[PDB]
JSON list of C-alpha atoms (C1' of nucleotides) in Angstrom, two decimals:
[
{"chain": "S", "resi": 1396, "resn": "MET", "atom": "CA", "xyz": [96.00, 19.19, 132.22]},
{"chain": "S", "resi": 1397, "resn": "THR", "atom": "CA", "xyz": [96.37, 15.59, 131.38]},
{"chain": "S", "resi": 1398, "resn": "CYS", "atom": "CA", "xyz": [94.31, 15.14, 128.21]},
{"chain": "S", "resi": 1399, "resn": "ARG", "atom": "CA", "xyz": [97.30, 15.15, 125.75]},
{"chain": "S", "resi": 1400, "resn": "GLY", "atom": "CA", "xyz": [99.37, 12.59, 127.74]},
{"chain": "S", "resi": 1401, "resn": "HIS", "atom": "CA", "xyz": [102.14, 15.07, 128.54]},
{"chain": "S", "resi": 1402, "resn": "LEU", "atom": "CA", "xyz": [101.67, 17.58, 131.30]},
{"chain": "S", "resi": 1403, "resn": "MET", "atom": "CA", "xyz": [100.68, 20.69, 129.51]},
{"chain": "S", "resi": 1404, "resn": "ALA", "atom": "CA", "xyz": [101.63, 23.84, 131.49]},
{"chain": "S", "resi": 1405, "resn": "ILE", "atom": "CA", "xyz": [98.90, 26.37, 131.97]},
{"chain": "S", "resi": 1406, "resn": "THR", "atom": "CA", "xyz": [101.46, 28.98, 130.94]},
{"chain": "S", "resi": 1407, "resn": "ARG", "atom": "CA", "xyz": [101.87, 30.41, 127.42]},
{"chain": "S", "resi": 1408, "resn": "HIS", "atom": "CA", "xyz": [104.41, 27.66, 126.78]},
{"chain": "S", "resi": 1409, "resn": "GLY", "atom": "CA", "xyz": [101.89, 24.97, 127.41]},
{"chain": "S", "resi": 1410, "resn": "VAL", "atom": "CA", "xyz": [98.54, 26.06, 126.01]},
{"chain": "S", "resi": 1411, "resn": "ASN", "atom": "CA", "xyz": [99.75, 27.68, 122.85]},
{"chain": "S", "resi": 1412, "resn": "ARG", "atom": "CA", "xyz": [101.50, 24.45, 121.83]},
{"chain": "S", "resi": 1413, "resn": "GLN", "atom": "CA", "xyz": [98.00, 22.68, 121.53]},
{"chain": "S", "resi": 1414, "resn": "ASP", "atom": "CA", "xyz": [96.49, 22.90, 118.17]},
{"chain": "S", "resi": 1415, "resn": "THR", "atom": "CA", "xyz": [93.44, 24.97, 119.28]},
{"chain": "S", "resi": 1416, "resn": "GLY", "atom": "CA", "xyz": [93.71, 27.86, 116.74]},
{"chain": "S", "resi": 1417, "resn": "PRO", "atom": "CA", "xyz": [95.70, 31.04, 116.09]},
{"chain": "S", "resi": 1418, "resn": "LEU", "atom": "CA", "xyz": [92.77, 33.28, 117.02]},
{"chain": "S", "resi": 1419, "resn": "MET", "atom": "CA", "xyz": [92.56, 31.53, 120.44]},
{"chain": "S", "resi": 1420, "resn": "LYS", "atom": "CA", "xyz": [96.36, 31.50, 121.12]},
{"chain": "S", "resi": 1421, "resn": "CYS", "atom": "CA", "xyz": [96.75, 35.25, 120.29]},
{"chain": "S", "resi": 1422, "resn": "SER", "atom": "CA", "xyz": [94.09, 36.04, 122.89]},
{"chain": "S", "resi": 1423, "resn": "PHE", "atom": "CA", "xyz": [96.01, 34.60, 125.90]},
{"chain": "S", "resi": 1424, "resn": "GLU", "atom": "CA", "xyz": [99.62, 35.58, 125.10]},
{"chain": "S", "resi": 1425, "resn": "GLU", "atom": "CA", "xyz": [102.20, 35.75, 122.34]},
{"chain": "S", "resi": 1426, "resn": "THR", "atom": "CA", "xyz": [99.83, 37.65, 119.86]},
{"chain": "S", "resi": 1427, "resn": "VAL", "atom": "CA", "xyz": [102.16, 38.78, 117.13]},
{"chain": "S", "resi": 1428, "resn": "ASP", "atom": "CA", "xyz": [104.26, 35.64, 117.47]},
{"chain": "S", "resi": 1429, "resn": "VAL", "atom": "CA", "xyz": [101.43, 33.19, 117.05]},
{"chain": "S", "resi": 1430, "resn": "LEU", "atom": "CA", "xyz": [99.80, 35.27, 114.33]},
{"chain": "S", "resi": 1431, "resn": "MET", "atom": "CA", "xyz": [103.14, 35.37, 112.38]},
{"chain": "S", "resi": 1432, "resn": "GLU", "atom": "CA", "xyz": [103.63, 31.58, 112.75]},
{"chain": "S", "resi": 1433, "resn": "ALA", "atom": "CA", "xyz": [100.20, 30.95, 111.52]},
{"chain": "S", "resi": 1434, "resn": "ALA", "atom": "CA", "xyz": [100.71, 33.21, 108.63]},
{"chain": "S", "resi": 1435, "resn": "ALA", "atom": "CA", "xyz": [103.93, 31.73, 107.67]},
{"chain": "S", "resi": 1436, "resn": "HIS", "atom": "CA", "xyz": [102.56, 28.10, 107.85]},
{"chain": "S", "resi": 1437, "resn": "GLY", "atom": "CA", "xyz": [99.13, 29.00, 106.38]},
{"chain": "S", "resi": 1438, "resn": "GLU", "atom": "CA", "xyz": [97.21, 27.48, 109.27]},
{"chain": "S", "resi": 1439, "resn": "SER", "atom": "CA", "xyz": [93.42, 27.49, 109.39]},
{"chain": "S", "resi": 1440, "resn": "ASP", "atom": "CA", "xyz": [90.99, 28.32, 112.14]},
{"chain": "S", "resi": 1441, "resn": "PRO", "atom": "CA", "xyz": [87.77, 26.16, 112.15]},
{"chain": "S", "resi": 1442, "resn": "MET", "atom": "CA", "xyz": [85.95, 28.97, 114.02]},
{"chain": "S", "resi": 1443, "resn": "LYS", "atom": "CA", "xyz": [84.70, 26.93, 116.87]},
{"chain": "S", "resi": 1444, "resn": "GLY", "atom": "CA", "xyz": [86.38, 28.45, 119.98]},
{"chain": "S", "resi": 1445, "resn": "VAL", "atom": "CA", "xyz": [84.43, 30.99, 122.07]},
{"chain": "X", "resi": 1, "resn": "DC", "atom": "C1'", "xyz": [140.80, 8.99, 111.96]},
{"chain": "X", "resi": 2, "resn": "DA", "atom": "C1'", "xyz": [136.29, 10.51, 111.16]},
{"chain": "X", "resi": 3, "resn": "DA", "atom": "C1'", "xyz": [131.25, 10.68, 112.18]},
{"chain": "X", "resi": 4, "resn": "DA", "atom": "C1'", "xyz": [126.87, 9.53, 114.91]},
{"chain": "X", "resi": 5, "resn": "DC", "atom": "C1'", "xyz": [124.33, 11.15, 119.26]},
{"chain": "X", "resi": 6, "resn": "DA", "atom": "C1'", "xyz": [124.09, 12.37, 124.13]},
{"chain": "X", "resi": 7, "resn": "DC", "atom": "C1'", "xyz": [125.11, 15.43, 128.15]},
{"chain": "X", "resi": 8, "resn": "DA", "atom": "C1'", "xyz": [126.71, 19.52, 130.62]},
{"chain": "X", "resi": 9, "resn": "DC", "atom": "C1'", "xyz": [127.67, 24.22, 130.10]},
{"chain": "X", "resi": 10, "resn": "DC", "atom": "C1'", "xyz": [127.52, 28.82, 128.18]},
{"chain": "X", "resi": 11, "resn": "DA", "atom": "C1'", "xyz": [125.25, 32.41, 125.62]},
{"chain": "X", "resi": 12, "resn": "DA", "atom": "C1'", "xyz": [121.12, 34.58, 123.70]},
{"chain": "X", "resi": 13, "resn": "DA", "atom": "C1'", "xyz": [116.11, 36.07, 123.92]},
{"chain": "X", "resi": 14, "resn": "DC", "atom": "C1'", "xyz": [110.39, 36.43, 125.17]},
{"chain": "X", "resi": 15, "resn": "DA", "atom": "C1'", "xyz": [106.74, 37.48, 127.66]},
{"chain": "X", "resi": 16, "resn": "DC", "atom": "C1'", "xyz": [104.27, 38.33, 132.00]},
{"chain": "X", "resi": 17, "resn": "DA", "atom": "C1'", "xyz": [103.71, 40.90, 136.10]},
{"chain": "X", "resi": 18, "resn": "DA", "atom": "C1'", "xyz": [94.77, 41.95, 138.84]},
{"chain": "X", "resi": 19, "resn": "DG", "atom": "C1'", "xyz": [90.15, 44.49, 137.49]},
{"chain": "X", "resi": 20, "resn": "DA", "atom": "C1'", "xyz": [89.84, 48.85, 136.83]},
{"chain": "X", "resi": 21, "resn": "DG", "atom": "C1'", "xyz": [87.79, 54.04, 138.23]},
{"chain": "X", "resi": 22, "resn": "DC", "atom": "C1'", "xyz": [88.70, 59.54, 138.82]},
{"chain": "X", "resi": 23, "resn": "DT", "atom": "C1'", "xyz": [91.54, 63.85, 138.71]},
{"chain": "X", "resi": 24, "resn": "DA", "atom": "C1'", "xyz": [95.57, 67.09, 137.72]},
{"chain": "X", "resi": 25, "resn": "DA", "atom": "C1'", "xyz": [99.59, 69.29, 134.50]},
{"chain": "X", "resi": 26, "resn": "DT", "atom": "C1'", "xyz": [104.31, 69.73, 130.49]},
{"chain": "X", "resi": 27, "resn": "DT", "atom": "C1'", "xyz": [105.47, 69.30, 126.21]},
{"chain": "X", "resi": 28, "resn": "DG", "atom": "C1'", "xyz": [102.68, 74.51, 121.69]},
{"chain": "X", "resi": 29, "resn": "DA", "atom": "C1'", "xyz": [111.11, 73.07, 116.94]},
{"chain": "X", "resi": 30, "resn": "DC", "atom": "C1'", "xyz": [114.75, 75.11, 114.77]},
{"chain": "X", "resi": 31, "resn": "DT", "atom": "C1'", "xyz": [119.55, 78.01, 111.19]},
{"chain": "X", "resi": 32, "resn": "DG", "atom": "C1'", "xyz": [120.03, 78.14, 106.79]},
{"chain": "X", "resi": 33, "resn": "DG", "atom": "C1'", "xyz": [119.41, 78.85, 101.39]},
{"chain": "X", "resi": 34, "resn": "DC", "atom": "C1'", "xyz": [116.48, 80.46, 98.35]},
{"chain": "X", "resi": 35, "resn": "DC", "atom": "C1'", "xyz": [112.23, 82.50, 95.85]},
{"chain": "X", "resi": 36, "resn": "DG", "atom": "C1'", "xyz": [108.70, 85.82, 96.09]},
{"chain": "X", "resi": 37, "resn": "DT", "atom": "C1'", "xyz": [106.71, 90.56, 98.11]},
{"chain": "X", "resi": 38, "resn": "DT", "atom": "C1'", "xyz": [107.44, 94.38, 99.48]},
{"chain": "X", "resi": 39, "resn": "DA", "atom": "C1'", "xyz": [110.34, 98.51, 101.87]},
{"chain": "X", "resi": 40, "resn": "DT", "atom": "C1'", "xyz": [114.18, 101.10, 101.07]},
{"chain": "X", "resi": 41, "resn": "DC", "atom": "C1'", "xyz": [118.03, 103.52, 98.55]},
{"chain": "X", "resi": 42, "resn": "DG", "atom": "C1'", "xyz": [119.25, 105.65, 94.32]},
{"chain": "X", "resi": 43, "resn": "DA", "atom": "C1'", "xyz": [118.94, 108.34, 89.28]},
{"chain": "X", "resi": 44, "resn": "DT", "atom": "C1'", "xyz": [116.38, 111.41, 86.45]},
{"chain": "X", "resi": 45, "resn": "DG", "atom": "C1'", "xyz": [113.25, 114.17, 85.89]},
{"chain": "X", "resi": 46, "resn": "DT", "atom": "C1'", "xyz": [109.66, 118.20, 86.08]},
{"chain": "X", "resi": 47, "resn": "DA", "atom": "C1'", "xyz": [107.19, 121.48, 89.29]},
{"chain": "X", "resi": 48, "resn": "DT", "atom": "C1'", "xyz": [107.89, 125.14, 92.58]},
{"chain": "X", "resi": 49, "resn": "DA", "atom": "C1'", "xyz": [110.94, 128.27, 95.66]},
{"chain": "X", "resi": 50, "resn": "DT", "atom": "C1'", "xyz": [114.71, 131.26, 95.69]},
{"chain": "X", "resi": 51, "resn": "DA", "atom": "C1'", "xyz": [118.99, 134.11, 93.74]},
{"chain": "X", "resi": 52, "resn": "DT", "atom": "C1'", "xyz": [121.18, 136.55, 89.85]},
{"chain": "X", "resi": 53, "resn": "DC", "atom": "C1'", "xyz": [120.99, 139.32, 86.03]},
{"chain": "X", "resi": 54, "resn": "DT", "atom": "C1'", "xyz": [118.45, 142.24, 82.50]},
{"chain": "X", "resi": 55, "resn": "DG", "atom": "C1'", "xyz": [114.56, 145.34, 81.11]},
{"chain": "X", "resi": 56, "resn": "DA", "atom": "C1'", "xyz": [111.00, 149.00, 81.92]},
{"chain": "X", "resi": 57, "resn": "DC", "atom": "C1'", "xyz": [109.24, 152.44, 85.10]},
{"chain": "X", "resi": 58, "resn": "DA", "atom": "C1'", "xyz": [110.15, 155.81, 88.92]},
{"chain": "X", "resi": 59, "resn": "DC", "atom": "C1'", "xyz": [112.56, 159.39, 91.57]},
{"chain": "X", "resi": 60, "resn": "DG", "atom": "C1'", "xyz": [116.73, 162.04, 91.67]},
{"chain": "X", "resi": 61, "resn": "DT", "atom": "C1'", "xyz": [121.01, 164.35, 89.99]},
{"chain": "X", "resi": 62, "resn": "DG", "atom": "C1'", "xyz": [123.43, 166.36, 86.27]},
{"chain": "X", "resi": 63, "resn": "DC", "atom": "C1'", "xyz": [125.80, 168.44, 81.84]},
{"chain": "X", "resi": 64, "resn": "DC", "atom": "C1'", "xyz": [124.47, 171.34, 78.44]},
{"chain": "X", "resi": 65, "resn": "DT", "atom": "C1'", "xyz": [121.79, 174.75, 75.84]},
{"chain": "X", "resi": 66, "resn": "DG", "atom": "C1'", "xyz": [119.50, 178.72, 75.73]},
{"chain": "X", "resi": 67, "resn": "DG", "atom": "C1'", "xyz": [117.55, 182.46, 78.60]},
{"chain": "X", "resi": 68, "resn": "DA", "atom": "C1'", "xyz": [117.72, 185.92, 81.94]},
{"chain": "X", "resi": 69, "resn": "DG", "atom": "C1'", "xyz": [120.01, 190.18, 85.15]},
{"chain": "X", "resi": 70, "resn": "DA", "atom": "C1'", "xyz": [122.75, 194.61, 86.09]},
{"chain": "X", "resi": 71, "resn": "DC", "atom": "C1'", "xyz": [125.15, 197.59, 84.42]},
{"chain": "X", "resi": 72, "resn": "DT", "atom": "C1'", "xyz": [127.27, 200.26, 80.66]},
{"chain": "X", "resi": 73, "resn": "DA", "atom": "C1'", "xyz": [128.08, 203.11, 76.20]},
{"chain": "X", "resi": 74, "resn": "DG", "atom": "C1'", "xyz": [126.40, 206.18, 72.98]},
{"chain": "X", "resi": 75, "resn": "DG", "atom": "C1'", "xyz": [123.30, 207.06, 69.91]},
{"chain": "X", "resi": 76, "resn": "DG", "atom": "C1'", "xyz": [118.27, 206.08, 68.11]},
{"chain": "X", "resi": 77, "resn": "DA", "atom": "C1'", "xyz": [113.99, 208.10, 68.89]},
{"chain": "X", "resi": 78, "resn": "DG", "atom": "C1'", "xyz": [111.84, 212.29, 69.88]},
{"chain": "X", "resi": 79, "resn": "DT", "atom": "C1'", "xyz": [110.08, 218.21, 71.97]},
{"chain": "X", "resi": 80, "resn": "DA", "atom": "C1'", "xyz": [109.86, 222.74, 70.58]},
{"chain": "X", "resi": 81, "resn": "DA", "atom": "C1'", "xyz": [110.30, 226.45, 66.44]},
{"chain": "X", "resi": 82, "resn": "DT", "atom": "C1'", "xyz": [110.51, 227.58, 61.93]},
{"chain": "X", "resi": 83, "resn": "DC", "atom": "C1'", "xyz": [109.82, 228.17, 56.91]},
{"chain": "X", "resi": 84, "resn": "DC", "atom": "C1'", "xyz": [107.03, 228.17, 53.02]},
{"chain": "X", "resi": 85, "resn": "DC", "atom": "C1'", "xyz": [105.32, 224.63, 49.73]},
{"chain": "X", "resi": 86, "resn": "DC", "atom": "C1'", "xyz": [101.22, 223.40, 48.68]},
{"chain": "X", "resi": 87, "resn": "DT", "atom": "C1'", "xyz": [96.57, 222.16, 49.74]},
{"chain": "X", "resi": 88, "resn": "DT", "atom": "C1'", "xyz": [91.82, 223.31, 50.37]},
{"chain": "X", "resi": 89, "resn": "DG", "atom": "C1'", "xyz": [88.70, 226.66, 49.20]},
{"chain": "X", "resi": 90, "resn": "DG", "atom": "C1'", "xyz": [86.15, 230.56, 46.48]},
{"chain": "X", "resi": 91, "resn": "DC", "atom": "C1'", "xyz": [83.80, 233.14, 42.28]}
]
DNA sequence: CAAACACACCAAACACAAGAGCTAATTGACTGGCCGTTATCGATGTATATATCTGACACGTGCCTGGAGACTAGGGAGTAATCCCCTTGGC
Protein backbone atom coordinates (compact mmCIF):
# COMPACT_ATOMS: atom_id res chain seq x y z
CA MET A 1 0.00 0.00 0.00
CA THR A 2 3.00 2.35 0.45
CA CYS A 3 5.33 1.31 -2.36
CA ARG A 4 4.47 4.14 -4.79
CA GLY A 5 4.87 6.91 -2.21
CA HIS A 6 1.20 7.84 -2.32
CA LEU A 7 -1.46 5.83 -0.51
CA MET A 8 -2.84 3.57 -3.23
CA ALA A 9 -6.36 2.53 -2.32
CA ILE A 10 -7.15 -1.17 -2.63
CA THR A 11 -10.27 -0.19 -4.57
CA ARG A 12 -10.53 -0.04 -8.35
CA HIS A 13 -9.56 3.63 -8.11
CA GLY A 14 -6.22 2.75 -6.51
CA VAL A 15 -4.95 -0.47 -8.10
CA ASN A 16 -5.96 0.21 -11.71
CA ARG A 17 -3.95 3.46 -11.62
CA GLN A 18 -0.78 1.41 -11.23
CA ASP A 19 1.00 0.49 -14.46
CA THR A 20 0.57 -3.27 -13.98
CA GLY A 21 -1.10 -4.15 -17.27
CA PRO A 22 -4.52 -3.98 -18.93
CA LEU A 23 -4.98 -7.75 -18.71
CA MET A 24 -4.54 -7.51 -14.95
CA LYS A 25 -6.71 -4.43 -14.41
CA CYS A 26 -9.65 -5.85 -16.35
CA SER A 27 -9.66 -8.94 -14.12
CA PHE A 28 -10.40 -6.94 -10.96
CA GLU A 29 -12.88 -4.28 -12.13
CA GLU A 30 -13.49 -1.80 -14.95
CA THR A 31 -13.08 -4.45 -17.65
CA VAL A 32 -14.38 -2.67 -20.75
CA ASP A 33 -13.12 0.69 -19.50
CA VAL A 34 -9.49 -0.36 -18.99
CA LEU A 35 -9.50 -2.41 -22.18
CA MET A 36 -10.82 0.56 -24.18
CA GLU A 37 -8.23 2.88 -22.66
CA ALA A 38 -5.41 0.47 -23.48
CA ALA A 39 -6.66 0.03 -27.04
CA ALA A 40 -6.90 3.79 -27.55
CA HIS A 41 -3.44 4.43 -26.11
CA GLY A 42 -1.91 1.31 -27.63
CA GLU A 43 -0.45 0.05 -24.37
CA SER A 44 1.51 -3.18 -24.14
CA ASP A 45 1.34 -6.08 -21.70
CA PRO A 46 4.71 -7.70 -20.88
CA MET A 47 2.89 -10.95 -20.01
CA LYS A 48 4.33 -11.38 -16.52
CA GLY A 49 1.36 -11.21 -14.15
CA VAL A 50 -0.26 -14.41 -12.93
C1' DC B 1 -9.61 46.10 -17.47
C1' DA B 2 -8.22 41.55 -18.63
C1' DA B 3 -5.92 37.05 -17.54
C1' DA B 4 -3.53 33.57 -14.42
C1' DC B 5 -4.71 29.98 -10.70
C1' DA B 6 -7.00 28.50 -6.50
C1' DC B 7 -11.21 27.20 -3.69
C1' DA B 8 -16.02 26.12 -2.71
C1' DC B 9 -20.04 24.62 -4.75
C1' DC B 10 -23.12 22.38 -8.10
C1' DA B 11 -24.05 19.03 -11.50
C1' DA B 12 -23.04 14.69 -13.92
C1' DA B 13 -21.63 9.59 -14.08
C1' DC B 14 -19.20 4.40 -12.73
C1' DA B 15 -18.83 0.38 -10.51
C1' DC B 16 -19.52 -2.72 -6.66
C1' DA B 17 -22.51 -5.06 -3.57
C1' DA B 18 -19.32 -13.58 -0.90
C1' DG B 19 -18.56 -18.61 -2.86
C1' DA B 20 -21.67 -21.00 -4.88
C1' DG B 21 -25.14 -25.62 -5.15
C1' DC B 22 -30.15 -27.74 -6.41
C1' DT B 23 -35.08 -27.56 -8.01
C1' DA B 24 -39.49 -25.60 -10.11
C1' DA B 25 -42.40 -22.87 -13.97
C1' DT B 26 -44.10 -18.56 -18.19
C1' DT B 27 -43.09 -16.72 -22.11
C1' DG B 28 -44.47 -21.15 -27.91
C1' DA B 29 -46.43 -12.55 -32.34
C1' DC B 30 -49.34 -10.22 -35.16
C1' DT B 31 -53.06 -7.21 -39.63
C1' DG B 32 -52.20 -6.12 -43.92
C1' DG B 33 -50.86 -6.34 -49.18
C1' DC B 34 -49.66 -9.20 -52.45
C1' DC B 35 -48.37 -13.45 -55.34
C1' DG B 36 -49.12 -18.23 -56.00
C1' DT B 37 -52.45 -22.65 -55.56
C1' DT B 38 -56.34 -24.12 -55.55
C1' DA B 39 -61.84 -24.14 -54.74
C1' DT B 40 -65.71 -22.15 -56.46
C1' DC B 41 -68.95 -19.73 -59.76
C1' DG B 42 -70.05 -19.25 -64.53
C1' DA B 43 -70.54 -20.23 -70.13
C1' DT B 44 -70.74 -23.49 -73.69
C1' DG B 45 -71.17 -27.43 -75.00
C1' DT B 46 -72.61 -32.59 -76.03
C1' DA B 47 -74.77 -36.85 -73.89
C1' DT B 48 -79.03 -38.62 -71.98
C1' DA B 49 -84.00 -38.03 -70.20
C1' DT B 50 -88.45 -36.41 -71.28
C1' DA B 51 -92.31 -33.94 -74.20
C1' DT B 52 -94.48 -32.71 -78.75
C1' DC B 53 -95.38 -33.79 -83.26
C1' DT B 54 -95.27 -36.98 -87.46
C1' DG B 55 -95.24 -41.60 -89.60
C1' DA B 56 -96.53 -46.71 -89.86
C1' DC B 57 -99.37 -50.34 -87.91
C1' DA B 58 -103.62 -51.85 -85.46
C1' DC B 59 -108.54 -52.02 -84.14
C1' DG B 60 -112.82 -49.85 -85.08
C1' DT B 61 -116.47 -47.09 -87.49
C1' DG B 62 -118.25 -45.66 -91.80
C1' DC B 63 -119.83 -44.13 -96.79
C1' DC B 64 -120.36 -46.15 -100.79
C1' DT B 65 -121.04 -49.84 -104.30
C1' DG B 66 -122.91 -53.83 -105.59
C1' DG B 67 -125.70 -57.85 -104.05
C1' DA B 68 -129.52 -59.91 -101.98
C1' DG B 69 -135.04 -60.59 -100.35
C1' DA B 70 -140.30 -60.70 -100.98
C1' DC B 71 -143.51 -59.91 -103.73
C1' DT B 72 -145.63 -58.94 -108.13
C1' DA B 73 -147.00 -59.09 -113.29
C1' DG B 74 -147.66 -61.60 -117.28
C1' DG B 75 -145.82 -64.28 -120.50
C1' DG B 76 -141.90 -67.78 -121.63
C1' DA B 77 -141.41 -72.55 -121.28
C1' DG B 78 -143.99 -76.60 -121.61
C1' DT B 79 -148.35 -81.36 -121.54
C1' DA B 80 -151.41 -83.78 -124.28
C1' DA B 81 -153.32 -84.80 -129.42
C1' DT B 82 -153.12 -84.55 -134.06
C1' DC B 83 -151.61 -84.65 -138.97
C1' DC B 84 -149.06 -86.56 -142.57
C1' DC B 85 -144.46 -85.65 -144.42
C1' DC B 86 -140.90 -88.44 -144.90
C1' DT B 87 -137.78 -91.79 -143.36
C1' DT B 88 -136.42 -96.58 -142.93
C1' DG B 89 -137.13 -100.80 -144.94
C1' DG B 90 -138.06 -104.46 -148.75
C1' DC B 91 -137.55 -107.26 -153.40
